[PDB]
Each structure stands twice: as C-alpha cells, then as structure tokens.
C-alpha cells in the first residue's frame, strides 16, 4: 500500500532552528480555521507555524534515541472552537544519517582451533553492531578486518575468523592474540570499533 | 477532507541544486523494487534519488510560471519489471515566496467629485496588481500611499481615494493631480509602483 500520511525530517540537523518538517493540508476553506496537533512531542518539539499547516521542529533530533513520532492533526474554527474535520493520524519519521560506527559486542572474544588444521578452518565468530538504520543504504552494513595477526588468521565480512595457514603448530605458539577492527560500508570507524580475539591452538 | 498525496517545494531556491521535494512510501516488500515516476516534468525536473523513494528537483522553480505538477508513482520489481502496487497519483505543489511587487499597468487614472464635498467623500478607485499567491501570508496584499497631494486627498489600502478637506473649491482649483504608490504588505515595491490620479471638481 502507498503510505501518504507521513512527514520526514533528517536527524542531527546542524543549521539554525527551527527546521521545517512538512505540511498539513485540509480541504476546508473556512479561513477562521486553524491547524492543531496533538500526540508525541506535539507542541513541544513539533509546532505548527501558520496559517498554512507547516510543522517545524524546535530541537535537533537523534534517530537513535527516537526514530518516529505519532501525531494527530485537526482543523478548528477559532471563532467557536468547532472541529471542522475528523482528526487525522500521521507519523513524523526521523530520516537516518550515518553517524554511528560499528562497535564490538565484547572487548575480548575467545576461540580455539586444533593445531595443523587445514587452511580456511573456521575458528570463531566476532560481531560488531552499528546503531544506524539497517534499512538505509549501507548505514549499518558492518565489515571486518584483522589489523594484528592477519598472517595467521583471516576474517570474512560476517566476522567469521578462519586459519590463514595450514601449518599452525601449538609448539611454536599455543595462543594468538589478534586484533580485529570493524567499519561500516561508508567507512565509519572506530573505537569501540576494535577488539581482541584470543585463539588457543589445541593439541 | 485531509489531502496527504502531496509534496511541497519552495520556489526560487537559491542553494546548490539539487533540491529535496519529498519522499514516496510503499509498504512493499522487496528487496528488488524501485520507485518510478511519470507525469508533469517527471524525470527532467523531478527525479527519484535512491533507494527510499526520495524525489529531488533539478531546476529552480517559479510558482508564477507553474504552481503545481501532477505526477504518478509506481513501484516496480527490478528483476522482472512487474508492478508491485497500483500506481498512485500525487501533486508536487510549488510554495510561494514574496518575489513580486504590485504593478500599476494603468498609470493615469481619472476621477471626479463635487466641489465643497464633505471630508471623506469617495472619489475613485485605483488598483495595482501583485502576481504572488493571494492565499499565502500577505504576499499579494496590496497597500497604497499618497506621495503627492496629501493635503487634498487620502487613499485607503483598497485604493479608494477620498477628499481630505471640505473646502475643495472649483473656482480656485477645478483639478488636482495626486500620485499614489503601491507596495505589498511585506514592503515589496519596484519599478512600476506609482500612478497619477487626475481629479476634477464638478458642479
Ligand atoms: Ca544520531
Ligand atoms: Ca553506521
Ligand atoms: Ca543515524
Ligand atoms: Ca517567482
Ligand atoms: Ca511568488
Ligand atoms: Ca508580493
């Protein structure tokens, strides 16, 4: 279905308040009429600025705090306070910007793998989460790199760590401490965007 | 009735092209669908910019040239070119700015009034035309001032000229030339802003 009862405003707008959100339109043509709103942050963050039905935002918004607001519109005869229309529900949607980097879910991950496993043996999985909107182009798309120990292990872009060599010998080294870094597809990183993986070689 | 199938963009936008108009929303689905538009200046002035159904304008607009544009939106599966919704009609409205001053096309008006008429006697009506939108915030509200001949006549903000004295005497002076200035209520005046009124006393 087509969804038309929506307004959209970008988060984190850094030009001077207030900021234009969108415009209400009722077909009545009583010019004693006024647009009135109620609902989530109606008349605090979002205010009508008239007489045309324009709604403005009076705070900078963070989609990661609240991503949308449910409001209801009216239109009122200011002579007699009569409601001229049925009220109309709508949503003000806060449009995502890429303002978060992926952050690992743990400071230290642990795994193990038998010594002398074939090249490309899966060891363990690391995970970083990006607080941006995962339905927007790439904003919460996470990619991974090993930045210390990449000669010994590789990582795929799901965070899966694999042996990078077929000759890992427990006698030479029984525990690797490797450093992983995460970074969203638009390049945003990072700290808490690194972590450590302790990988023990088993006998 | 509430009219939700609308977008609005201000005319005579001075910042870098291109300029955000609004956003289409289908509750569909893919994951493989694309927003496609047709209609007045679709795909030349107005283009979808992807992938969330945002429309942008690629020219500056003049409401006085064209005030609105009828378009139809589609949502199409990229794979097989199947439509995924019935099309939806919508209008892109161009929001007025105050960029026109009242213009006198007729620059000489003629009126008459009996000599020795009382103060406040109606003489004639002058009219200047303002090309902006009469439904928006004073933009085409015309006001008038007398800038020559104030001692003898007044003008109201509807352009009606009145006697300013009860002793206008046909034997002493049978004809006056006053000059009227028009400007809109927001102060905009320009090159065609004055007219002469030739007033003759009768009896
Ligand atoms: Ca944010
Ligand atoms: Ca991100
Ligand atoms: Ca964000
Ligand atoms: Ca214009
Ligand atoms: Ca205009
Ligand atoms: Ca004007």
Curated annotation (Swiss-Prot), chains A, B:
Residues involved in Ca(2+) 2 binding: 11, 64, 96-97, 99, 132
Binding-site list for Ca(2+) 3: 98, 100, 130, 132, 139, 184
Binding site for Ca(2+) 1: 11-12, 62, 64, 99
Residue span(s) of domain Cadherin: 1-104, 105-203
Compartment annotation: Cell junction, Adherens junction; Cell membrane; Cytoplasm
Domain of life of the organism encoding this protein: Eukaryota
Glycan attachment residues as annotated in the record: 81, 110
Posttranslational mods: N-glycosylated.
Function: Cadherins are calcium-dependent cell adhesion proteins. They preferentially interact with themselves in a homophilic manner in connecting cells; cadherins may thus contribute to the sorting of heterogeneous cell types. This cadherin may play a important role in endothelial cell biology through control of the cohesion and organization of the intercellular junctions. Plays a role in coupling actin fibers to cell junctions in endothelial cells. Associates with CTNND1/p120-catenin to control CADH5 endocytosis.
Free-text note on domains in this protein's UniProt record: Three calcium ions are usually bound at the interface of each cadherin domain and rigidify the connections, imparting a strong curvature to the full-length ectodomain.
Protein name: Cadherin-5
Encoding gene, per UniProt annotation: CDH5
């Amino acid at each position: 279905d087509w969804i038309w009862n929506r307004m959209h405003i970008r988060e984190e707008i850094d030009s001077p308040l207030p900021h234009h959100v969108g415009k209400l339109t009722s077909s009545v043509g009583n010019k004693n009429a006024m647009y009135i709103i109620e609902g989530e942050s109606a008349n605090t963050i979002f205010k009508v600025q008239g007489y045309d039905g324009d709604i403005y935002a009076f705070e900078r918004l963070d989609r990661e705090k609240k991503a949308e607001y449910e409001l209801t519109a009216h239109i009122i005869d200011r002579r007699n306070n009569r409601s001229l229309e049925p009220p109309s529900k709508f949503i003000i949607k806060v449009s995502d910007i890429n303002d978060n980097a992926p952050i690992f879910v743990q400071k230290i991950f642990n795994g193990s793998v038998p010594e002398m496993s074939r090249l490309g043996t899966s060891v363990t999985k690391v995970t970083a989460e990006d607080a941006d909107d995962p339905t927007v182009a790439g904003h919460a798309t996470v990619t991974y790199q090993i930045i210390k120990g990449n000669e010994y292990f590789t990582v795929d872009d799901s965070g899966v760590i694999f042996t990078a060599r077929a000759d890992l010998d427990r006698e030479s080294q029984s525990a690797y401490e490797i450093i992983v870094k995460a970074k969203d597809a638009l390049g945003l990183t990072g700290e808490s965007s690194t972590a450590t993986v302790i990988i023990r070689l088993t006998d």
